[PDB]
């Protein structure tokens, strides 16, 4: 039959989700029509009505983290979770398509761009003299947003597929963290946010996000965390987390979103990246392929009727 409903970010990018007008244009001449939350914690979340009762294969793709600073190393990719689920007719599936975390370089500011190309070495100078980054903060990418697929019960959302996002690459990240994936399948494990420090941590499933630069949880709007407070008032390092619980960027990398948010560097280490998020698959489904880092840029959701 090859009936495939493909969900994207509707052209939106950054710490905020898409609008209804953006998604109305993005799905033109397609077989797909969704509702977008206009305000509140559902802002930017797409709502799709399941057309028929059948066995569906939901392919979730997370979003990648932000690029590094002068090094411009390979960004931490998002996670892919592919599952098989049974759905009923007229079930209302809520889909949040994770957006990429904002990159550090390149940038539109003239003073910033000289730092990206390696001509302005004030950041490297302060590290060599005083052993750490305390004054000229910034240069790392923001945390990537996670892709959430859930359906509302009577009053409480229940997750089905969560494709964790990748952590932000640090400014002076000579290493790539070489990190394995994580996948949880017990709903009794609560998905709190990541360990936010100088850089913002990742947003989880259900938490109480306090820090502005930390990624908001799914039930709090999943807004991308703001830039580092110390990276402001000295630069214009607007390196924010991606829509979907992405953490804000600093000299260190921001944490990526997911079920359990990724951790962040506690002391603004310029060589320490933010950690990737934790993926989740509901016990109601069957894991087709284990979680794997595959996605560069924005995430997606694909339904294909497997068995």
């Amino acid at each position: 039959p090859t009936v495939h409903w493909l969900f994207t970010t509707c052209g939106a990018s950054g710490p905020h989700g898409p609008t209804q007008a953006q998604c109305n244009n993005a799905y033109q001449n397609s077989n797909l029509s969704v509702e977008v939350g206009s305000e509140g914690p559902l802002k930017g979340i797409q709502i799709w009505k399941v057309p028929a009762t059948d066995t569906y294969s939901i392919s979730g793709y997370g979003a990648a983290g932000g690029k590094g600073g002068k090094n411009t190393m390979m960004r931490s990719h998002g996670v892919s979770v592919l599952g098989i689920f049974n759905l009923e007719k007229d079930d209302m599936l809520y889909i949040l398509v994770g957006q990429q975390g904002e990159d550090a370089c390149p940038s539109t500011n003239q003073l910033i761009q000289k730092v990206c190309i390696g001509e302005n070495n004030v950041i490297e100078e302060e590290i060599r003299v005083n052993r750490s980054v305390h004054e000229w903060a910034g240069g790392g990418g923001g945390g990537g947003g996670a892709t959430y697929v859930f359906k509302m019960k009577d009053g409480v959302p229940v997750p089905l597929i969560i494709a964790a996002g990748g952590g932000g690459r640090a400014y002076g990240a000579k290493t790539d963290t070489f990190h394995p994936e994580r996948l949880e399948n017990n709903s009794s494990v609560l998905g709190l946010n990541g360990n936010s420090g100088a850089a913002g941590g990742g947003g989880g499933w259900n938490d109480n996000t306090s820090l502005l630069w930390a990624g908001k949880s799914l039930q709090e709007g999943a807004t991308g965390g703001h830039s580092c407070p110390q990276a402001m008032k000295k630069w214009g390092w607007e390196t924010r987390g991606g829509f979907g619980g992405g953490g804000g960027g600093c000299s260190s990398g921001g944490g990526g979103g997911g079920y359990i948010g990724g951790n962040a560097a506690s002391n603004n280490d310029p060589e320490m990246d933010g950690e990737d998020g934790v993926s989740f698959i509901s016990p109601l489904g069957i894991l087709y392929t284990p979680a794997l880092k595959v996605m560069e840029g924005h995430g997606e959701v694909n339904i294909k009727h497997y068995l």
Partner: protein, 58 residues
Amino acid sequence: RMKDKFLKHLTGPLYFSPKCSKHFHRLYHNTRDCTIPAYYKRCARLLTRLAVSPVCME
């Protein structure tokens, strides 16, 4: 035919443990990323991340 010749160049001499024999077959042949040629850059990263997973180690 040719998917096998192309993707090996991207991933190199990758090894898969016996515990991932059916995990490799499902990913290589049945996943959307490894069936659309436009997403072969995705499939190469999928197989590489598979080899470093705790299941496919040793």
